[PDB]
Amino acid sequence: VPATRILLLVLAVIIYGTAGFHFIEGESWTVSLYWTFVTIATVGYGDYSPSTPLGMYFTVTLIVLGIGTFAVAVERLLEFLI
Amino acid sequence: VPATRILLLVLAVIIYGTAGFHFIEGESWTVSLYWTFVTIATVGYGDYSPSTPLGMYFTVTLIVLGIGTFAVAVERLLEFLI
Amino acid sequence: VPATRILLLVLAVIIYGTAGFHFIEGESWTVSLYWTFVTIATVGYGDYSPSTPLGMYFTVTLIVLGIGTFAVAVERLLEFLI
Amino acid sequence: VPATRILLLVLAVIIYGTAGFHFIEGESWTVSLYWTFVTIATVGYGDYSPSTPLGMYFTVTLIVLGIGTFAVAVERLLEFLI
Numbered sequence: 001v002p003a004t005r006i007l008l009l010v011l012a013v014i015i016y017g018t019a020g021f022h023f024i025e026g027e028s029w030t031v032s033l034y035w036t037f038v039t040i041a042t043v044g045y046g047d048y049s050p051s052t053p054l055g056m057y058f059t060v061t062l063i064v065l066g067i068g069t070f071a072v073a074v075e076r077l078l079e080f081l082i
Numbered sequence: 083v084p085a086t087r088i089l090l091l092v093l094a095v096i097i098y099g100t101a102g103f104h105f106i107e108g109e110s111w112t113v114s115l116y117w118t119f120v121t122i123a124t125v126g127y128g129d130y131s132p133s134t135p136l137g138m139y140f141t142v143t144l145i146v147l148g149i150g151t152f153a154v155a156v157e158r159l160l161e162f163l164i
Numbered sequence: 165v166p167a168t169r170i171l172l173l174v175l176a177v178i179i180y181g182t183a184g185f186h187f188i189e190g191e192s193w194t195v196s197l198y199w200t201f202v203t204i205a206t207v208g209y210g211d212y213s214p215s216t217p218l219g220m221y222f223t224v225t226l227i228v229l230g231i232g233t234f235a236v237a238v239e240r241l242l243e244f245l246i
Numbered sequence: 247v248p249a250t251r252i253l254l255l256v257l258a259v260i261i262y263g264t265a266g267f268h269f270i271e272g273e274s275w276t277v278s279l280y281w282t283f284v285t286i287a288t289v290g291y292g293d294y295s296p297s298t299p300l301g302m303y304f305t306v307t308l309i310v311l312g313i314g315t316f317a318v319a320v321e322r323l324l325e326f327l328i
């Protein structure tokens with residue numbers, strides 16, 4: 001896949017994760033964007049995490065859709081900077 | 083391995099992790115499924131974690147059996163959506 | 165590398181991580197083995213973590229030496245079960 | 247990329263992460279170095295994490311720049327020890 005397409009895909013993942021956490025769990029936009037990156041990178045500090053059943057289901061969907069997309073994006077970003 | 087077989091394997095991993103956490107650590111089915119995904123993806127928030135010796139041994143077995151299975155499943159899922 | 169050699173290497177990693185956490189941070193042998201797996205798999209729940217400067221340095225050494233060894237071991241284990 | 251160049255790149259990542267966490271979040275140099283390794287390895291215990299908006303943005307930049315660099319460095323280090 002072209003690197004620019006990979007960029008769009010991970011951006012869509014970031015929008016999906018941020019808006020979902022914000023509306024479902026009620027955290028701020030900034031915290032929700034930070035949590036999304038922390039999650040799809042598998043860092044998972046746990047300073048923020050879903051506490052409702054709907055948020056838990058949503059988080060599973062983000063894990064399944066975003067961790068692989070983020071991994072490919074980082075590998076592509078390595079090629080353009082190194 | 084065919085992608086559909088990989089699907090069955092990760093599903094078996096999910097059943098194993100969910101039922102084990104539920105019966106060993108006593109959390110609800112929903113929390114146990116959420117914890118299983120969070121674990122085999124290596125996100126590991128830590129909002130839920132085993133607190134008994136048996137749960138700790140079980141969690142090691144799930145880590146050894148599920149992290150690799152989940153990684154292959156996500157890589158295959160990328161091929162079918164991208 | 166032969167799969168059996170990879171097995172020995174990750175076992176040495178596990179011994180090193182368990183004994184170090186036990187003696188440096190003072191946790192039990194069982195907790196220390198559980199923490200070692202949780203760490204080298206990058207799950208990192210955070211229910212246990214080093215709280216002394218020496219434990220923090222030791223944990224960095226285990227992260228650098230064990231995460232790659234564990235990743236190869238899981239990939240090899242996939243070949244023998246799938 | 248030559249293994250020695252990869253070494254320099256991850257070292258630059260470590261300097262960037264340590265100084266940033268120290269100055270932005272105000273933790274000690276030692277804690278900040280430990281947190282940097284824990285983050286770029288994706289272990290993410292969560293015993294330390296950014297609590298300010300600026301620290302959250304900085305942490306995203308470190309996640310995007312350091313996780314891929316660290317992964318290549320560990321894979322190269324495996325070749326020189328195994």
Ligand SMILES: [K+]
Nearest residue numbers: 043125207289
């Ligand atoms: K983690």
Ligand SMILES: [K+]
Nearest residue numbers: 045127209291
């Ligand atoms: K954590």
Ligand SMILES: [K+]
Nearest residue numbers: 044126208290
């Ligand atoms: K974690």
Ligand SMILES: [K+]
Nearest residue numbers: 071153235317
């Ligand atoms: K890989």
Ligand SMILES: [K+]
Nearest residue numbers: 042124206288
């Ligand atoms: K991880």
